[PDB]
Design an enzyme around this catalytic site. Structure first.
Site, PDB file in Angstrom:
ATOM      1  N   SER A  12       0.862  -1.194   0.000  1.00 59.83           N
ATOM      2  CA  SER A  12       0.000   0.000   0.000  1.00 59.83           C
ATOM      3  C   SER A  12       0.892   1.235   0.000  1.00 59.83           C
ATOM      4  O   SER A  12       1.791   1.334  -0.861  1.00 59.83           O
ATOM      5  CB  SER A  12      -1.004  -0.123   1.147  1.00 59.83           C
ATOM      6  OG  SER A  12      -1.955   0.906   1.124  1.00 59.83           O
ATOM      7  N   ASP A  30      -8.648  -4.325  -6.439  1.00 55.98           N
ATOM      8  CA  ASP A  30      -8.242  -3.303  -5.473  1.00 55.98           C
ATOM      9  C   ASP A  30      -9.042  -2.028  -5.697  1.00 55.98           C
ATOM     10  O   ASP A  30      -9.016  -1.462  -6.789  1.00 55.98           O
ATOM     11  CB  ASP A  30      -6.750  -3.046  -5.649  1.00 55.98           C
ATOM     12  CG  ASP A  30      -6.144  -2.318  -4.475  1.00 55.98           C
ATOM     13  OD1 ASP A  30      -6.862  -1.506  -3.839  1.00 55.98           O
ATOM     14  OD2 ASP A  30      -4.936  -2.572  -4.199  1.00 55.98           O
ATOM     15  N   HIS A  46      -7.441  -5.195  -1.852  1.00 50.23           N
ATOM     16  CA  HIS A  46      -6.281  -4.411  -1.429  1.00 50.23           C
ATOM     17  C   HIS A  46      -5.496  -5.081  -0.315  1.00 50.23           C
ATOM     18  O   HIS A  46      -4.268  -4.964  -0.253  1.00 50.23           O
ATOM     19  CB  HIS A  46      -6.755  -3.036  -0.946  1.00 50.23           C
ATOM     20  CG  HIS A  46      -5.612  -2.102  -0.607  1.00 50.23           C
ATOM     21  ND1 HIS A  46      -4.707  -1.689  -1.558  1.00 50.23           N
ATOM     22  CD2 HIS A  46      -5.212  -1.524   0.565  1.00 50.23           C
ATOM     23  CE1 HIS A  46      -3.810  -0.893  -0.985  1.00 50.23           C
ATOM     24  NE2 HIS A  46      -4.093  -0.771   0.299  1.00 50.23           N
TER      25      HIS A  46
END
Length: 259
Positions: free
Chosen positions: A130, A176, A208
């Site tokens: 991330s 995602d 995600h």
């Protein structure tokens, strides 16, 4: 011969392994000891008889602790790497700060008596999830001597990575909605130089948060990438080129052959 080869000749099963060929130990880095990052855990092979190892730093994403990436530590280190999983200085740190912290974590390894004689300081890599994957890209753009970079569902406002010279495996999650691949991962891949050794691996059906619990596809191809580029280990080219056959990969693009 390649003096950086470690461990037995691989197979698909050996890169899928939860525990690799090397026994590992660990040491904790406190927040106070960590100059420029939030502390961490270092995982390392205890067998020194094959030589020193490359080093890898791994960052979590926004709001997340080291615990969200911890599983990668021993799984990668046991393939023959010194791996530091970090906490960031604060849970709200942005990508460029996370990139500085990844570099600071690598730099720490050179100073820590428990591992400094186990690393080859010339052979280092960055990974992250991330915003931590955005951080990995930022660290690579700031340090062309890094040997590999692996953003996992990377998030960054910076979309053009034309200055990166570090072999990069971009791991996207197909579904995602936080760092959608069309505007994050695969856009980053497309803006890396066309002549870089690079690949884009999209995880079928994944959200995600796929990297926050063990994912075999993520681990196996991260291991293969680190072996191929941190250790220049040509025994691992076979897993990356031609494209991997795993169902769990919806899409794979690369600049294969890397040889």
């Amino acid at each position: 011969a390649n003096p950086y080869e470690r461990g037995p000749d691989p197979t698909e099963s050996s890169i899928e392994a939860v525990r690799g060929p090397f026994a590992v130990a660990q040491t904790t880095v406190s927040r106070l000891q960590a100059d420029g990052f939030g502390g961490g855990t270092i995982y390392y092979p205890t067998d020194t008889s094959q030589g020193t190892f490359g080093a890898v730093a791994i960052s979590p994403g926004f709001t997340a602790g080291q615990e969200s990436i911890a599983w990668l530590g021993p799984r990668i280190a046991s393939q023959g790497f010194v791996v530091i999983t970090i906490d960031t200085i604060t849970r709200l740190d942005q990508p460029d700060s996370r990139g500085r912290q990844l570099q600071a974590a690598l730099d720490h390894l050179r100073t820590n008596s428990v591992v400094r004689n186990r690393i080859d300081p010339n052979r280092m890599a960055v990974m992250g999830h991330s915003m931590g994957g955005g951080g990995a890209l930022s660290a690579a753009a700031n340090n062309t001597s890094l040997e590999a970079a692996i953003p996992l569902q990377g998030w960054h406002t910076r979309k053009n990575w034309s200055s990166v010279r570090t072999p990069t495996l971009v791991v996207g999650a197909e579904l995602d909605t936080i760092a959608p691949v069309s505007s994050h991962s695969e856009a980053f891949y497309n803006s890396l130089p066309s002549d870089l050794d690079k690949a884009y691996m999209e995880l079928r059906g994944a959200s995600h948060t796929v990297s926050n619990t063990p994912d075999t596809t993520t681990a196996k191809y991260s291991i293969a990438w680190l072996k191929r580029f941190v250790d220049k280990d040509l025994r691992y080219e076979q897993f990356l080129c031609p494209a991997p056959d795993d169902f769990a990969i919806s899409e794979y693009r690369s600049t294969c052959p890397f040889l």
